[model samples]
Target: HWGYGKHNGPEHWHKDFPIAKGERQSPVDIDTHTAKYDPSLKPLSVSYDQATSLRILNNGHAFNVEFDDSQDKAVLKGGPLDGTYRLINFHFHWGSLDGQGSEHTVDKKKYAAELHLVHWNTKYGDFGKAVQQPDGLAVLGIFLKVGSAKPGLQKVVDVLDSIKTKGKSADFTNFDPRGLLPESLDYWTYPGSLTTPPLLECVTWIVLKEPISVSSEQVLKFRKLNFNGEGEPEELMVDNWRPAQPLKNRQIKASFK
Candidate 1:
């Protein structure tokens, strides 16, 4: 994971990291106005067994959950997307304060935060190779808001103490990431790229319509992270989220039927 020092910020990301110009740049705003309807798209039918082996990775940039090949059942299929993909990692983009935390804005409205579950197709053998394929990846976006407590997310938050300090992480065992998914799997699907540097255009985005809530205190705890190492004084790392980008003639479809 990259740090947020003066030189490591998003603006200079492409320079230090050559893959910045790639098409799949993420953290783009999701505009529903220009979206079109497509009946051919279908919901992903991931199984429970595959959902159990997820590993929690505290890579310093964000708290990410990594999945293994055994979780293939969670991949997407049908619609403009047709392939067998495996979930690779999922991370969050939040604001420094509760006023705004989301990365993707819908007509200028921001939520508490945005969670991206990254997946890559098996067609190219593994995540390293598939990420280069046009249809190699799929990302599930879940918007988060600060409000009433959400028991589902508490599982992850409860462990913050263990990884509260920078560059610190612990085994997040017995946690089922799937339980955090919205009750309605129906989503808005589109073709996009990674929101971060090395942004490849190989992703199919599945953003949920419903948003989940977390306690205000939980939101505050997340904002306490710092890009600097644990030895340094702690600095609030809120507002690490990126602004949305231009639609560029892309189509976002929903499974609302």
Candidate 2:
């Protein structure tokens, strides 16, 4: 129904998923002038269980690491949430060239990439069941800066070379998602929806203030990914990010001064 292409992409998404034009669309720009400081937001509580690191795969568009979210052992307890949000899957949005793929920008500044950790609220039942409500999803957003080699990313990159084509997956473990987090947990919180469809307005975004580094060479490997079927057109996967949406009347809250 939607993609990141030209004639048949984001602009055309509304033709298939009407919610694409919804009030709370994501990939918004973080403008300091318009942002309000909120003192009550709690520190993000990320408790990940290494055992839950299941499999990493390239489901055509991007690389995602699936997690076992059947229990509360691995969950984000705090942040602007009322209950627990179990981690389901984590994926990335990047580009062919360096410094051109992040979906969320700060002061209209786009980064090389962005990482999204998708989670669902357990209070609403399973993922499908949770999607029906307003406050059912919480996606943590992390921007990636181009700098020194990301030793940690090498683990994930080692697999990217193998998953160049879609439908490819590999075994992954002994990896904790926490290691990917930046030292500073300061972030900007807001209400938004999935960058893709059905474009549900159910996400509470937590965009970290600080960005982690990933070398240019390491990011180049991701461009090898394909958007086509096995051995098909094999279109190079790049610029796989949605453009920033309008802020409308929503107020973004800064966790730090």
Candidate 3:
């Protein structure tokens, strides 16, 4: 019953996934001026081996580009993390409107969409085990601005036709996620939980300051995704975004002031 729309949306998720109401939850509103600058934060060492890309699936929640996390083929190091975080999957959240849908906001303003490149802390040996630890996950957040078409994203959109329904999955490989990032690696770091439930408070969030562009048409296509699978009357998957949660006691650290 947990969904991001209508009845069982984010507001009702706490009934099932109690962690949804946790104090360190994510999808925060970033106030750059409020964050403290950290000159010691190291430049991020991010590498993505497209070969390990397993497939893309619309898991009824969101379309996730799954990766083979068995090896350190692709990983994120440095930044605000202690060790390494293995790339596991990448997904997006959006609304039917071009102005809405992103989970995180900046200065009280929302973007067109948000992308999350999910990784697990390798200190625990495996992702399954890592997710349960306090320092278990790291999610890179990239905001999507509604502007010119993003050529790098066209390849990802091309696959939507094949895996348009919920629970549908298709082979998706050799596409490097590095192309999706913005020109600047500058970001704000924070400790928060996953936007989705079990709302695990294991993420070391790195929100890029620069937003990438997405064509208005592409934003519309994102809305075309279906929350229902085949044989279940088609329902357009729109507004699959969680609301901003309380920041609580976490401090915001910026790689650059």
Candidate 4:
């Protein structure tokens, strides 16, 4: 079923994507001060080209990919942070309307969109197997805000004309997603679940504090996508994002000195 309207919103996502109940859910409100302090944590140095391999997929989700050995490297040596993981895919969650987009909120304010960069632990053999592991994945969260001036995201929008329809893809060959990353890599790390169905709780969330801006028109265009299929009725995905959830008993750590 295509996702939209009241009752059809994410509250009922579990009805369609049954795996939602089990998957690790995100967009949880983060209260940094309440979390236990871990001063030992430091920022992970990343070499864009060496650590990432970019790809584009036609899974009807309009997603992008970025993977590599460095991305899969563990965080704490053999302690749930091993080098057996590899970055797998990245995608976005936006709204049907231009003014409001994005699944997660910060300080109760909604942004224009949100990007998810997914990675899987190779120790489990592959992405499928990795998804089943308790600590098999890591996702980086980037927020997008709407503005009058373009924030250089046109590079991606330019290619939208090609994948305008669902399941349709063009040669996004030689594309580097690193170009889309925010200049400040600083982030807040935590243990959480996926925002979508099969909501696995095997993720180490690295949410960036800074956000990127895009033109309001670009945000509006994204909402025109059809959730059912390429040729299906065009529905407004303007507010496809889910509201932030409770933090539970989790702790969030930042990479600031």
User: What is each predicted model's overall lDDT from 0 to 1?
Assistant: 0.70, 0.86, 0.88, 0.63
Q: Write the per-residue lDDT of candidate 1 for residues 34-71, one digit (tens) a residue.
A: 56656666666654345544556555667775556654
Stronger candidate by TM-score (1 vs 4): 1
Model 3, TM vs. native: 0.97
Tell me the deviation in Å of residue 166 in model 3: 1.1
Candidate whose TM-score is highest: 3
Q: Name the runs in model 3 displaced over 4 angstroms.
A: 49-51
Ranked candidates, highest lDDT first: 3, 2, 1, 4
Residue-level lDDT of model 4, residues 95-150, one tens digit each, is: 65555566666656677788887777667777778778778887778888876545
User: Could you tell me the lDDT of residue 218 within candidate 2?
Assistant: 86
Q: Whole-model lDDT, candidate 4?
A: 0.63
TM, every model: 0.87, 0.96, 0.97, 0.81
| All-Cα superposition RMSD per candidate | 2.5, 1.3, 1.2, 3.8
The Cα error of candidate 3 at residue 13, in Å, is 0.7
Which parts of model 4 have CA positions greater than 4 angstroms off? Answer: 1-8, 16-24, 35-37, 50-62, 65-81, 148-152
Q: After the best TM-score superposition of candidate 1, give how far the Cα of residue 144 lies from its true spot, in angstroms.
A: 0.7
**After superposition, which runs of candidate 2 have C-alpha atoms over 4 Å from their true positions?**
none
**TM-score: model 2 vs. ground truth:** 0.96
Model 2 poorest 10 in a row by lDDT: 45-54
Residue lDDT tens for model 2, 43-86: 88887753387888888678899888787757886878889898
Q: Is candidate 1 or candidate 3 better by TM-score?
A: 3
lDDT of 3 by residue, 69-121 (tens): 88888999999899989999999998878778899998888988899999998
